[PDB]
C-alpha cells in the first residue's frame, strides 16, 4: 500500500508519495529506461491501495489498477464506491469487500464522462495540494456531482503525477495555492497512451516513433514528438502503458 497525508504536506512529502506510488507498480522490463507496466495481473494483486488523509486526518482508500494506473473505486468509512464500468466492477470482486454497502457511481472513470458529470472540463478545475484535500473531504460523503469534480482532481494529482514528472512538479508548485492545470499538463494526460505506444514501437525502429505525437509545451506552443531523444521521453514520462492494453 502507499499513503499520503495532507496534514503537514509540502512539495517534498508529496514528491515522496509520488515516488512510493511509482515504486509500488510492478514491472519486469524497462523500455528506454522507463518502467513498462505489466500486460496483466490476476486476482487481488492487480490493485494497489492508496491511503489518503485529509488535513483533519479523515481518510479514504483508493484502489488503483497496477497495469494502467486507472483508479477503479475507493472506500470511505464503511461504504465503497466504484466507477460504472466493467473493469471497476471486476475490481469490486477483490477490494473493499468488507464495506457495509457498495455504491456504483453513475458514470465511468474516463475524463469525458467525469467532466460531463461535473459540469465543467478539467481546464477549468483548479488542482493542487489544497484541491486534493478538498477532494478527499468531498469523497467522504456521497454526492455524485461533487464527487465527479473531486475525482478529476484526485486522478490528476495521483495517478497522472506518477506518469509524468512535469505533472508531479506542476502539483508541487501548487502545494499551497491551486491553479487550473497548464495546457501542457492536459496534453500529456491526453497523450499518455499514444506516447507509451510510440516509445514501445521505437524499440525496433531505431528510437524513431512510427507515428509522431503532438503535444503542447510549457509556453503553450504545439510541438511534435518524433523519437526517443525528445525531453518528453528522456526526462518526463515515468511509466509506460503496455501496448497489449492499447
Ligand X SMILES: OC[C@H]1O[C@H](O[C@H]2O[C@H](CO)[C@@H](O)[C@H](O)[C@H]2O)[C@H](O)[C@@H](O)[C@@H]1O
Ligand Y SMILES: *[C@@H]1O[C@H](CO)[C@@H](O)[C@H](O)[C@H]1NC(C)=O
Residue 86 beta carbon to ligand X: minimum distance, rounded to whole angstroms: 11
Flag whether 111 is marked binding: yes
Q: Which of residues 65-104 bind ligand X (CB under 6 A)?
A: 69-71, 83
Residue 188 beta carbon to ligand Y: minimum distance, rounded to whole angstroms: 16
Flag whether 160 is marked binding: yes
Catalytic residue among 160, 168, 173, 179: 160
CA distance 129 to 133: 6
Among ligand X, ligand Y, none, partner that 73 touches (CB below 5 to 8 angstroms by kind):
none
CA distance 228 to 192: 14
Note whether 159 binds ligand X by CB under 6 A.
Answer: yes
What is the DSSP-derived secondary structure letter of residue 205? T
Flag whether 168 is marked binding: no
Q: Which residue, 18 or 237, has its beta carbon nearer to ligand Y?
A: 237
Among ligand Y, ligand X, none, partner that 144 touches (CB below 5 to 8 angstroms by kind):
none
Flag whether 74 is marked binding: no
Residue 192 beta carbon to ligand X: minimum distance, rounded to whole angstroms: 7
Note whether 218 binds ligand X by CB under 6 A.
Answer: no
- Which own/partner pairs from 23-30 qualify as long-range (CB within 8 Å, at least 24 positions apart)? 24/48, 24/66, 25/66, 25/69, 25/162, 25/239, 26/66
Contacts to ligand Y by CB under 6 A: 208, 226-227, 229-230
Among ligand Y, ligand X, none, partner that 166 touches (CB below 5 to 8 angstroms by kind):
none
Edge-first strand listing for the sheet containing 2-5: 2-5, 47-53, 59-65, 70-76, 79-82, 101-104
CA distance 44 to 40: 12
Residue 46 beta carbon to ligand X: minimum distance, rounded to whole angstroms: 13
CA distance 183 to 69: 21
Kind of pairing between the strands at 59-65 and 47-53:
antiparallel
Kind of pairing between the strands at 47-53 and 2-5:
parallel
Which residues participate in catalysis according to the annotation? 160
Contact residues: ligand X, CB under 6 A: 69-71, 83, 109-112, 155, 159-160
Amino acid at each position: 500500500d502507499v499513503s499520503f497525508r495532507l496534514s503537514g504536506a509540502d512539495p517534498s512529502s508529496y514528491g515522496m508519495f509520488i515516488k512510493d506510488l511509482r515504486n509500488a507498480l510492478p514491472h519486469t522490463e524497462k523500455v528506454y529506461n522507463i518502467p513498462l507496466l505489466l500486460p496483466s495481473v490476476s486476482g487481488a494483486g492487480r490493485y494497489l491501495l492508496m491511503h489518503l488523509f485529509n488535513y483533519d486526518g479523515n481518510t479514504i482508500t483508493v484502489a488503483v489498477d497496477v497495469t494502467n494506473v486507472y483508479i477503479m473505486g475507493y472506500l470511505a468509512l464503511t461504504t465503497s464506491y466504484f466507477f460504472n464500468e466493467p473493469a471497476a466492477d471486476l475490481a469490486s470482486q477483490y477490494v473493499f469487500r468488507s464495506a457495509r454497502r457498495k455504491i456504483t457511481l453513475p458514470y465511468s472513470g474516463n475524463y469525458e464522462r467525469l467532466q460531463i458529470a461535473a459540469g465543467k472540463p478539467r481546464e477549468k478545475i483548479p488542482i493542487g495540494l489544497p484541491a486534493l484535500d478538498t477532494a478527499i473531504s468531498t469523497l467522504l460523503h456521497y454526492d455524485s456531482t461533487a464527487a465527479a469534480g473531486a475525482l478529476l482532481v484526485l486522478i490528476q494529482t495521483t495517478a497522472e503525477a506518477a506518469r509524468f514528472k512535469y505533472i508531479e512538479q506542476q502539483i508541487q508548485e501548487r502545494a499551497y495555492r491551486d491553479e487550473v492545470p497548464s495546457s501542457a499538463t492536459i496534453s500529456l494526460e491526453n497523450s499518455w497512451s499514444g506516447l507509451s505506444k510510440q516509445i514501445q514501437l521505437a524499440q525496433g525502429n531505431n528510437g524513431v516513433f512510427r507515428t509522431p505525437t503532438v503535444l503542447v509545451d510549457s509556453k503553450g506552443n504545439r510541438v511534435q514528438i518524433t523519437n526517443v531523444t525528445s525531453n518528453v521521453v528522456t526526462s518526463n514520462i515515468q511509466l509506460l502503458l503496455n501496448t497489449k492494453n492499447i
